[PDB]
Amino acid sequence: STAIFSDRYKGQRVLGKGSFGEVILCKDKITGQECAVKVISKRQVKQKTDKESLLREVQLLKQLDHPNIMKLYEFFEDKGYFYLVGEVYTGGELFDEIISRKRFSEVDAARIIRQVLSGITYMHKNKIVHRDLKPENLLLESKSKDANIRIIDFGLSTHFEASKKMKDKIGTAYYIAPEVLHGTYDEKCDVWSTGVILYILLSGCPPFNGANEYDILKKVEKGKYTFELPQWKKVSESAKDLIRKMLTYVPSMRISARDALDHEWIQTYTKDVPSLDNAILNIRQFQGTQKLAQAALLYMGSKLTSQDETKELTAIFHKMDKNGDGQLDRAELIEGYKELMRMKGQDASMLDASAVEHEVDQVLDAVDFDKNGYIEYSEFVTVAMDRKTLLSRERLERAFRMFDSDNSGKISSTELATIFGVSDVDSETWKSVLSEVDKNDGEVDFDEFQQMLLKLCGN
Numbered sequence: 001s002t003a004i005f006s007d008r009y010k011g012q013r014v015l016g017k018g019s020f021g022e023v024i025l026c027k028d029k030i031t032g033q034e035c036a037v038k039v040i041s042k043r044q045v046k047q048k049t050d051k052e053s054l055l056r057e058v059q060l061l062k063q064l065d066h067p068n069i070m071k072l073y074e075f076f077e078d079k080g081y082f083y084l085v086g087e088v089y090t091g092g093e094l095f096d097e098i099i100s101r102k103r104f105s106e107v108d109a110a111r112i113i114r115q116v117l118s119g120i121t122y123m124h125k126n127k128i129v130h131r132d133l134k135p136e137n138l139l140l141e142s143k144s145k146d147a148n149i150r151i152i153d154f155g156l157s158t159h160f161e162a163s164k165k166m167k168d169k170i171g172t173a174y175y176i177a178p179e180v181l182h183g184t185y186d187e188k189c190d191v192w193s194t195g196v197i198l199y200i201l202l203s204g205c206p207p208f209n210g211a212n213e214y215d216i217l218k219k220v221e222k223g224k225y226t227f228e229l230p231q232w233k234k235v236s237e238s239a240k241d242l243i244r245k246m247l248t249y250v251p252s253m254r255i256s257a258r259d260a261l262d263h264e265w266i267q268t269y270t271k272d273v274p275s276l277d278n279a280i281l282n283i284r285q286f287q288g289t290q291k292l293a294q295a296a297l298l299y300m301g302s303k304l305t306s307q308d309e310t311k312e313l314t315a316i317f318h319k320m321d322k323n324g325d326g327q328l329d330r331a332e333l334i335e336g337y338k339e340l341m342r343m344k345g346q347d348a349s350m351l352d353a354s355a356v357e358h359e360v361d362q363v364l365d366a367v368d369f370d371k372n373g374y375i376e377y378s379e380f381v382t383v384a385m386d387r388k389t390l391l392s393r394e395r396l397e398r399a400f401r402m403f404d405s406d407n408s409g410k411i412s413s414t415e416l417a418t419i420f421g422v423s424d425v426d427s428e429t430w431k432s433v434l435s436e437v438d439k440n441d442g443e444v445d446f447d448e449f450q451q452m453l454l455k456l457c458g459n
């Protein structure tokens with residue numbers, strides 16, 4: 001018989017959303033081993049390769065081991081989902097650790113890039129390509145100041161098709177190698193993406209940029225960049241030589257990962273060096289902007305999902321209510337919430353019967369409903385969904401506060417232009433919505449920003 005994911009693992013909490021799906025902190029029910037499970041929904045993600053090829057890749061990945069590559073433990077598949085069970089890392093995204101520190105030098109950058117290049121080198125020796133290497137795929141193993149970088153998502157893009165949805169796409173255009181856009185690509189695309197990351201580490205600005213996603217892609221495809229910005233005066237010639245070699249347009253002429261490890265810059269700076277204060281400043285601004293744009297898109301998506309699920313759940317309970325008096329018991333609420341997860345593949349958190357029992361009890365405990373009697377289901381629906389809406393609203397607010405680093409309480413019109421450009425929300429469209437919200441002003445507070453987002457998702 002086929003092994004079942006939830007026979008072995010219980011969900012602890014959600015770690016986050018990554019490429020191809022949600023990631024849940026899980027725990028082995030016998031051994032206590034904790035793990036990070038990427039859950040891919042088959043309805044939402046199409047496979048590029050056949051079953052035979054995916055299984056073979058899994059079997060290889062399980063046997064690979066390198067300090068700078070996520071360890072894969074197990075793999076499960078059922079009717080609706082893939083469950084990718086990996087080692088859990090607790091140090092967060094690299095760029096989030098970098099913006100916290102007060103000093104950052106070419107020595108710190110070289111030590112980071114050496115780690116990325118070692119991991120890439122190992123995977124290329126094993127004929128595995130990333131293709132979607134970006135700052136978000138560089139996690140720190142733990143919270144220790146010295147901790148190793150673990151690259152996540154190697155091999156996924158070979159087997160599954162990327163989302164076309166901006167909420168998933170955001171951030172990708174800066175890093176993608178030109179040859180990936182045109183269709184003929186190989187392992188050298190990973191060196192390009194690393195070159196882009198290095199350019200950003202040392203100046204705090206992407207080498208290929210523009211006012212929206214297509215304008216970025218246009219700049220990537222042309223392939224031209226310069227080091228004429230002021231903060232490149234601080235930087236060694238050898239770093240720029242390595243960057244040039246990694247951002248070489250024709251992949252056969254581009255440096256390999258392994259050869260990049262032997263480059264003068266890596267050799268000097270990882271065995272007197274000033275801090276790159278302007279770079280840290282610009283990275284903090286870059287990161288903040290990207291995180292608010294993402295948070296804006298997830299808020300909009302979560303509002304749409306709620307409109308969908310609120311009405312669906314009501315229809316399920318109405319159907320279940322035999323004599324139509326509006327009263328269901330707890331086991332019926334559980335069954336209906338299960339029917340919702342059957343129709344919707346959204347909550348990776350809720351793909352196990354006991355998880356749903358627990359979530360229903362949390363809702364009943366909020367509403368002051370007794371769980372052993374019959375319950376007004378319409379009120380259960382309101383609370384279960386108001387809980388989600390509140391949680392989403394709080395999620396967005398924290399990201400607004402993070403972005404507003406001067407504690408002004410406001411985002412200016414220029415800043416909105418940048419955020420919505422990153423979010424790929426059309427310029428005349430957000431300006432139009434800003435006009436219906438701002439009837440005075442050139443700046444918005446949090447409530448106003450939130451109102452604009454509601455108007456940009458048909459509310």
Ligand SMILES: CC(C)n1nc(-c2ccc3cc(OCc4cccc(Cl)c4)ccc3c2)c2c(N)ncnc21
Nearest residue numbers: 015016017023036038084086087088089152155156
């Ligand atoms: C950033 C956060 C949401 N996240 N994501 C992950 C994460 C990211 C990618 C993962 C990829 C995984 O499997 C890759 C795989 C599995 C089978 C076949 C192929 Cl080709 C590739 C498994 C777990 C993963 C887990 C993660 C983690 N391991 N530790 C801490 N936080 C993590």
